[PDB]
Structure 1
């Protein structure tokens, strides 16, 4: 359970993201795919991209980045009361996209790295810890739905 102070730190940096959702989404997906190539292999849509320059040039990748960050922003702005938003996301990622919880850890690491690079004055250690906690809560709640469904592993 995040405190109100923790949530304010999270949403204060997240407001900065929403000024350039597509740029952040590109940086986060590219970092994910470069750091953890097994993740790229889950996207039939992107598995043709073999270099970072090709990733950065893909308009379809930039679109999907906005889709991801729009869904995460809507979850963060619920400050934990996010059951309605998570249900469908856990269900599709478990049963259709076949994404292990560990890859949600990986994309959480990429989000934190990109926020620190783009917003250092709003992403000091207090805010990094609060965002870590918010992303852990997201993973915890998704993992409980995976387990219901037979996919926690």
Structure 2
């Protein structure tokens, strides 16, 4: 679990992210695709985006960056009480798109990496420690829903 203090850290950071979601979304998605190209496949509008510049110009890529952070931010603001929110989430990603939990881990790596490079004095060792906990709780609460739907890859 996370404490009220830890939750304070995570929400304080995200507030800055949402101050520029589109921008944070591009960096994070582009960071995710570069580090793990396989996840790129999971988007059909991207059977052609190769260079980084192409990713930077893709209107879709940007819209998708907003969808993730928007939703993730919504989940983080629940400070742990997000079970009902994850239901539809796990439903669509597990069955409709078949996204492995491993991918959730990848995007978490990209999120930490991007926040660290972007919000220095706003994402200190303590803050990064709290975000790691938040995203972790997130993943495990999702996998729980994954097996419920019997999601077995």
Q: Report the TM-score range of the alignment, normalised by the length of the smaller protein.
A: over 0.9
Q: How many residues align?
A: 153
Q: Match of 1:40? A: 40
Residue 152 (structure 1) shift: 4.4
After superposing the two structures, state which structure 1 stretch, 44-53 or 21-30, moved more: 44-53
* Residues 43-69 of structure 1: per-residue CA shift (max 9 Å, x gap): 112121011110001111101100111
Structure 1 contact 101–152 (Cα < 8 Å) conserved: no
Distance across 1 between alignment mates of 2:146 and 2:5: 30
- Residues 7 and 152 of structure 1: CA distance in aligned 2, closer, same or farther (over 3 Å): farther
Distance across 2 between alignment mates of 1:25 and 1:152: 29
Structure 1 contact 143–152 (Cα < 8 Å) conserved: no
Aligned CA RMSD, in angstroms, stands at 0.8
TM-score normalised by structure 2 residue count:
0.97
* Residues 19-74 of structure 1: per-residue CA shift (max 9 Å, x gap): 10100000000000000011001111212101111000111110110011100010
| Structure 1 residues without counterparts, runs of 5 or longer | none
1:84 equivalent in alignment to 2:118: no
| Structure 2 residues without counterparts, runs of 5 or longer | none
Distance across 2 between alignment mates of 1:137 and 1:93: 17
Structure 1 contact 90–145 (Cα < 8 Å) conserved: yes
Distance across 1 between alignment mates of 2:75 and 2:126: 20
Distance across 2 between alignment mates of 1:90 and 1:152: 13
Q: Which runs of 4+ in 1 moved over 6 A?
A: none
Residue 9 (structure 1) shift: 0.6
Q: How does 1:1-153 map to 2 (within 5 A)?
A: 1-153=1-153
Distance across 2 between alignment mates of 1:152 and 1:130: 30
